[PDB]
Amino acid sequence: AFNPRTFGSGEADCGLRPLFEKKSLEDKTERELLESYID
Amino acid sequence: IVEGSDAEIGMSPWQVMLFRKSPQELLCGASLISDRWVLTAAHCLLYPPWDKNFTENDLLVRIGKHSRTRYERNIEKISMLEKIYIHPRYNWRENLDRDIALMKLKKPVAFSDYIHPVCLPDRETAASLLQAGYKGRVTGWGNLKETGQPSVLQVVNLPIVERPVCKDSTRIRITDNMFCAGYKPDEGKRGDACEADSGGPFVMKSPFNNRWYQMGIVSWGEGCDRDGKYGFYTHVFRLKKWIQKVIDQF
Ligand SMILES: *C[C@@](*)(O)[C@H](CCCNC(N)=[NH2+])NC(=O)[C@@H]1CCCN1C(=O)[C@H](N)Cc1ccccc1
Ligand SMILES: *[C@@H]1O[C@H](CO)[C@@H](O)[C@H](O)[C@H]1NC(C)=O
Ligand code: NA
Ligand SMILES: [Zn+2]
Ligand SMILES: [Zn+2]
Ligand SMILES: [Zn+2]
Ligand SMILES: [Zn+2]
Numbered sequence A: 001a002f003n004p005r006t007f008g009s010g011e012a013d014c015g016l017r018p019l020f021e022k023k024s025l026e027d028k029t030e031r032e033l034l035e036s037y038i039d
Numbered sequence B: 001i002v003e004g005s006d007a008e009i010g011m012s013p014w015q016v017m018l019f020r021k022s023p024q025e026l027l028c029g030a031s032l033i034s035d036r037w038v039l040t041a042a043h044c045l046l047y048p049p050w051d052k053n054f055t056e057n058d059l060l061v062r063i064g065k066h067s068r069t070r071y072e073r074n075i076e077k078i079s080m081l082e083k084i085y086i087h088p089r090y091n092w093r094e095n096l097d098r099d100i101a102l103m104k105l106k107k108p109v110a111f112s113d114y115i116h117p118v119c120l121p122d123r124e125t126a127a128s129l130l131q132a133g134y135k136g137r138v139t140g141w142g143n144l145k146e147t148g149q150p151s152v153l154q155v156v157n158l159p160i161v162e163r164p165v166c167k168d169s170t171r172i173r174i175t176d177n178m179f180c181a182g183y184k185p186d187e188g189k190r191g192d193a194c195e196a197d198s199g200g201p202f203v204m205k206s207p208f209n210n211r212w213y214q215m216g217i218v219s220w221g222e223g224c225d226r227d228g229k230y231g232f233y234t235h236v237f238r239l240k241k242w243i244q245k246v247i248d249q250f
Helices: A030-037 B124-128 B164-168 B237-249
Strands: B014-019 B025-032 B037-040 B059-063 B077-084 B100-107 B134-140 B155-160 B178-181 B202-206 B214-220 B231-235
Touching: A030 B124, A030 B134, A030 B155, B014 B037, B014 B100, B025 B214, B059 B100, B100 B178, B100 B237, B124 B214, B134 B214, B155 B164, B164 B178, B178 B214, B231 B237
Parallel strands: none
Antiparallel strands: B014 B025, B014 B059, B025 B037, B037 B100, B059 B077, B077 B100, B134 B155, B134 B202, B155 B178, B178 B231, B202 B214, B214 B231
């Protein structure tokens, strides 16, 4: 979407948290959002 | 944030705190979308009635902050702003239509365990996740109630509310550039953004690629966490072209 040269870095390394998704760990309330997707 | 909980360390690494330089004062929230671009609410930067019309030099941003009282040496980063961009059609006189602004940092920041960008929604993601009933997450260092201030970043998950219901909860003119969220009186759960939470992100975790996406920006509300009232957020996807134009312009 964004030209790396203007946007900088991040477009391809966004929304993944080092201390959670990167370590395969769920935060304490994240499931509430997932469950809200389930009908 | 009213009726929320403490955020765990590193739970919202895109969280940004917008500060007044002189005198030092926490003003709003914001979000990190890249190593050099920060998104926030336009009214956090420009709202003449509240004597707000900041220039790049009047502000500072803090990133990766865990406590508002101390300085995490090499953990939290303080950055100066190079340039400020306010949406040209931001309507501050009437209903805060297009309450969105971009700020470019003087120097890009290095990502870490405590600092990382949030994703901006693409057409496909926005379609499948931006639906009434689906819950998002709002974070902030703003007021704990209609007033005080927290010592730890606050968080609360809230369901997006159907347009017709948002429209009836207020007489302020709602636009397609806004969406509202919050529990109904009958749902038995509470929570809402409040004063100084403006600019903070309303994020959603995509069960698909497991990435967090910023769907909204805390923009306005009447009171905080009142029954039958809902928080209003700037509809980020709807204004992505302006974001594109600005970032790809400069
Ligand atoms: C700037 C922010 O801190 C703040 C966020 C409010 C979020 N509130 C809830 N319940 N989620 N915004 C406000 O304080 C904005 C700025 C302009 C006035 N305002 C309001 O929320 C008024 N209370 C209502 C309003 C006034 C004018 C236009 C639209 C709404
Ligand atoms: C912001 O302050 C500048 C003067 O320094 C002024 O020209 C501009 O009109 C202000 N923006 C307004 C009041 O909307
Ligand atoms: Na409410
Ligand atoms: Zn990274
Ligand atoms: Zn506590
Ligand atoms: Zn005035
Ligand atoms: Zn810390």
